[PDB]
Design a protein around this ligand. Structure first.
Ligand SMILES: COc1ccc(S(=O)(=O)N(CCO)CC(=O)NO)cc1
Ligand SMILES: [Ca+2]
Ligand SMILES: [Ca+2]
Ligand SMILES: [Ca+2]
Ligand SMILES: [Zn+2]
Ligand SMILES: [Zn+2]
Length: 158
């Protein structure tokens, strides 16, 4: 599967969910990128204009890729593996209610998983892994990648 073949990766926040404070969306996305840069050689930088490697989008229903969202619940987000164009991009279902806490769907935890995909990771069968394809809230203040996540990302980078 594809990986980014460079060490400096850019992201851009296309638009902001009205569910959250702007600074909280910025911080959640920043902290989620940091989870992955903690365990690889990668460096992430937010850019404000122009083409980013990873475009972060909030959208509902049909949104121009061939992967429609389904309203509240069900699919929370999806992302594309490394590559040109839409490659790397992470889309968050605006029909969810995004939060900084245990209420609704936690943006940070969801973004960690999505950014895993943006970097080339697939799903894990281990319930403990952030890449396990089922959302279960865990306290984000003390979140940790599982050994499975670490093995997975280190098999792709570093
Ligand atoms: C913790 O992160 C997530 C992110 C999304 C989802 S999910 O949206 O519920 N999901 C699970 C399969 O239906 C689709 C997926 O894996 N997208 O990447 C579940 C957990
Ligand atoms: Ca949904
Ligand atoms: Ca892209
Ligand atoms: Ca919403
Ligand atoms: Zn999409
Ligand atoms: Zn997934």
């Amino acid at each position: 599967g594809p990986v980014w073949r460079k060490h400096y990766i850019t992201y851009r926040i296309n638009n902001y969910t009205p569910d959250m404070n702007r600074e909280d969306v910025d911080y959640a996305i920043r902290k989620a990128f940091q989870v992955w840069s903690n365990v690889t050689p990668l460096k992430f930088s937010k850019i404000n204009t122009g083409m980013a490697d990873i475009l972060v989008v909030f959208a509902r229903g049909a949104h121009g890729d061939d992967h429609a969202f389904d309203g509240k619940g069900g699919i929370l987000a999806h992302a594309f593996g490394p590559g040109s164009g839409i490659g790397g991009d992470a889309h968050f279902d605006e029909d969810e209610f995004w939060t900084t806490h245990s209420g609704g769907t936690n943006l940070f935890l969801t973004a960690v998983h999505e950014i895993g995909h943006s970097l080339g990771l697939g799903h894990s069968s281990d319930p403990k892994a952030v890449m396990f394809p089922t959302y279960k809230y865990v306290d984000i203040n003390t979140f940790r990648l599982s050994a499975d996540d670490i093995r997975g990302i280190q098999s792709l980078y570093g």
